[PDB]
Design a protein around this ligand. Structure first.
Ligand SMILES: [Cl-]
Ligand SMILES: [Cl-]
Lengths: 206, 206
């Protein structure tokens, strides 16, 4: 959490430029609960490697125009942990339909299908980076008029830790010849979000 | 079942040409049971609209080279009913990895998520075409040294009925603005087959 600014309503015009120069960003959100179609989206965090992190506080009366630009941009890769969760909120709240998203949880489920510990952000961070993540601020009040120092730091860490985690999952995927499958699965995340948004369920079974 | 030929081991060179001229074919299979990774693949049926239908009897000692060419060909659309099932057999038996496949079951699950009747080939044929399909030969012995007249006719009908069914689902999908979602889902079928082949399960949940 080297350099973090809390923004109201939208990503700043400076980070939009930095995201476009970089071609790659990481994204996370804080909410009032676990149901992307019922609970409230409170903040969206965006990190530009080398530049810093913005915490965007959602306004009900404002589309976060420049944030939706980044999400939709084919030429900007957006890394998440559990992209289906975060994009479900973004889709239900803002009608956002993202392109070029990747997900460390999907990656982890391909590499370690039977191990829930390695499928969590904290499991990935400890295994790959030697880093212990503090998870206690996740249940705090993200709609509070002023985010605390602890909140800001927590919200920043969970986007700033994704670039090294994602790079390391890429290498493990390539080694086991599963990267093309992870690539195909990441490419399906936005469609999977639409299926959930429309209550269409599992279209691939009998 | 206007014009049907039973082929040993592979699709004929003439249908490979006709599939390439047409740019579109429909596909179905007959098997010894419902588990694509355990049960035997007995036949693969391929229909070229306007030309006819081949029933390919699988040989254990022979890759059906020209059939695998059609399956892999990006420029040839392959229509199935329940593509995940058929491609699971083709993937486990021949290591076949298909491109540009579409599926009437996936389409039906998007249009009618809660109605199992409309998600079956016979439900689709009756609703859309007014056609009653005889399903009794499905449990017959497809590894028998000579397929019966009833078997040949059954195996041919279930590929020849797919082109009108698929064209009609396209129109219903477009009308409700769900065709882009069906297109995205069809594009994911081969990856979903790989996930099942590797026992990776649902990579898109928590
Ligand atoms: Cl604040
Ligand atoms: Cl025969």
């Amino acid at each position: 959490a080297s350099t973090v600014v809390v923004r109201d309503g939208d990503l700043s015009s400076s980070f939009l430029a930095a995201a476009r120069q970089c071609g790659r960003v990481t994204i996370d959100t804080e909410t009032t609960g676990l149901s992307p179609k019922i609970d409230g989206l409170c903040t969206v965090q965006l990190h530009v490697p080398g530049v810093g992190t913005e915490i965007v506080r959602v306004d009900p009366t404002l589309q976060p125009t420049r944030l939706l630009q980044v999400l939709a941009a084919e030429e900007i890769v957006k890394g998440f942990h559990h992209a289906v969760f975060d994009l479900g909120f973004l889709r239900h709240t803002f009608q956002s339909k993202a392109r070029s998203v990747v997900c460390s949880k999907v990656a982890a489920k391909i590499l370690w299908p039977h191990d829930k510990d390695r499928q969590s952000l904290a499991g990935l961070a400890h295994l790959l980076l030697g880093v212990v993540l503090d998870k206690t601020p996740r249940l705090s009040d993200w709609s509070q008029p002023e985010l605390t120092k602890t909140q800001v730091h927590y919200a920043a860490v969970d986007v700033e830790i994704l670039p090294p985690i994602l790079d390391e999952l890429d290498r493990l995927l390539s080694e086991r010849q599963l990267r093309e499958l992870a690539v195909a699965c990441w490419h399906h995340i936005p469609a999977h979000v639409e299926l959930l948004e429309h209550n269409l369920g599992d279209v691939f079974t009998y």
